[PDB]
Amino acid sequence: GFPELKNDTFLRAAWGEETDYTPVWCMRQAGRYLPEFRETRAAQDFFSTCRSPEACCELTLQPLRRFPLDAAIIFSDILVVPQALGMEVTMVPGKGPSFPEPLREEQDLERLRDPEVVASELGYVFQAITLTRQRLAGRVPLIGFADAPWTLMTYMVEGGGSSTMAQAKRWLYQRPQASHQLLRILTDALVPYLVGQVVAGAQALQLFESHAGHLGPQLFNKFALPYIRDVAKQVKARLREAGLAPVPMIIFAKDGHFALEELAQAGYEVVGLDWTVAPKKARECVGKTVTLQGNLDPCALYASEEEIGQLVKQMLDDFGPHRYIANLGHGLYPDMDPEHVGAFVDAVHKHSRLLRQ
């Protein structure tokens, strides 16, 4: 009972269909680079301007008012799942995302909630999604998301960010059993959460495995890949059993060049790429079945609008007009110029049509 979708270019490309042009969207399009974002976010603390459906809906809609993006992604904050599981967050302006009491011992797993009750704890996210879907009025598709089990585990064990994930990786090597237990708890919480996002109106889903690069092939296949596979399988199955139409799913493993081949067979329609992987090589690695979501170096946007058009043109030529969704190689940075984000969007649209005509 939602408005009928008008522009579905993003969904068609996601399923691997040919389109009149290449659809484009930016990770963190609703981000600090936009002045209006900081103002709206300054209403209250992080987990308050997030817990308000109208607030999250507004943040989601903001970039679309500036740029003709081909998709919207629900605005939401990282640590919502770990939080819903029972962990306390202390979001400060300096550090950012943080758990004052991280999981360090196996016994620490006992304070976590049964993953089966997480969905009911995240009802505010579902409300924001429905509201955003209603307010979008079918302009473009709405993407729901969550972080992958391993990446969520790194936040829970590290307590925040890290350049090595040494504490989390120590868990993998020293506490393999406890690690698998935690990764399973995280998977059982993500499935109902992601399913709930689709039920609330999400028309696509992206799983962010942001800290994939810290693991090598072996650890990744052992602790990250199995759960990345389980999420897609279980989400699709539950959607079908509920009478709903599965949505296209995207797996993004930042710095996961070494896993591109496994990921193309992990049950996801789209495989997101970071900017370090050359488009053509990525095409080789993934094959010819899956859709590639595509990697401009976010920092490339620091260059002039003219230089951006040329870098975008070259990026499009490498990817080819088939099975491709333009995007950056990572989220937008806080100090980037909104005008340059517009140039990126306009360049993808202009050149993708030329690459066809």
Binding-site positions for coproporphyrinogen III read 28, 30, 32, 77, 155, 210, 330
Q: What is the 3-state secondary structure (H, E, C) of 69-85?
A: CCCEECCCCCCHHHHHC
Q: Which two tokens stand for residue 201?
A: 């109106």
DSSP state of 302: G
Work out how close the CB of 49 gets to a copy of itself at its nearest, in angstroms, rounded to a whole number.
Answer: 25
Looking at 65-73, 151-159, 197-205, 252-260, which segment touches a copy of itself (CB under 8 A)?
252-260
276: helix, strand or coil: coil
Q: Is residue 348 within 8 Å of residue 324, measured between CB atoms?
A: no
Which is closer to a copy of itself, CB of 113 or CB of 257? Answer: 257
Write each residue from 314 to 343 as x if it is in contact with a copy of itself (CB under 8 A), else as -, in one continuous string: ---------------x---x-x--------
Q: In the complex with a copy of itself, which residue's Cβ is closer, 204 or 253?
A: 253
Assign 3-state DSSP to the chain and report helix, strand, coil percentages, each to 5: 50, 10, 40
In the complex, the smallest distance separating the C-beta of residue 299 from a copy of itself, rounded to whole angstroms, is: 4
Cβ count near 98 (within 10 Å): 18
- 3-class DSSP assignment, residue 229: helix
Stretch that binds a copy of itself, among 52-60, 130-138, 145-153, 211-219 (CB under 8 A): 211-219
Q: Which of positions 111-130 make contact with a copy of itself (CB under 8 A)?
A: none
Task: Considering only residues 260 through 279, tell me which ones interact with a copy of itself, judged by CB under 8 A.
Answer: 275-278
Residue of 36, 77, 297, 346 interacting with a copy of itself (CB under 8 A): 297
- The torsion angles phi and psi of 86, rounded to 5 degrees, stand at 115, 5
Q: Residue 290 gets which letter from DSSP?
A: S
CB-nearer residue toward a copy of itself: 122 or 273: 273
Does residue 302 interact with a copy of itself by CB under 8 A? yes
Nearest distance from residue 283's CB to a copy of itself, in Å? 14
| C-beta closer to a copy of itself: residue 181 or 276 | 276
**Whole-number Å distance between alpha carbons of 185 and 179:** 10
Residue 327 pairs in a beta bridge with 295
**Residue 88 neighbours by CB distance under 10 Å:** 12
Residues listed for the chain: 357
Region near a copy of itself per CB under 8 A, out of 49-57, 66-74, 146-154, 217-225: 217-225
Among 45, 106, 108, 255, binds a copy of itself (CB under 8 A): 255
Q: What's the distance, CA 136 to chain centroid? A: 20
What residues between 143 and 182 interact with a copy of itself by CB under 8 A? 161, 163-164, 166, 169-170, 172-174
Return all residues near 1 (Cβ < 8 A) that are at least 6 apart: none
What is the C-alpha separation between 290 and 271, in angstroms, rounded? 7
Binding site, annotated residues for coproporphyrinogen I? 28, 30, 32, 41, 77, 155, 210, 330
Whole-angstrom distance, CA of residue 309 vs CA of residue 220: 36
- Using the 8-state DSSP alphabet, how is residue 96 labeled? B
Tell me whether residue 299 or residue 354 sits nearer to a copy of itself (CB atom). Answer: 299
Q: Where in the sequence numbering do the catalytic residues fall? A: 28, 32, 41, 77, 155
Binding site for a copy of itself (CB under 8 A): 161, 163-164, 166, 169-170, 172-174, 213, 215-219, 255, 257-258, 275-278, 281, 295, 297, 299-300, 302-303, 307, 311, 329, 333, 335
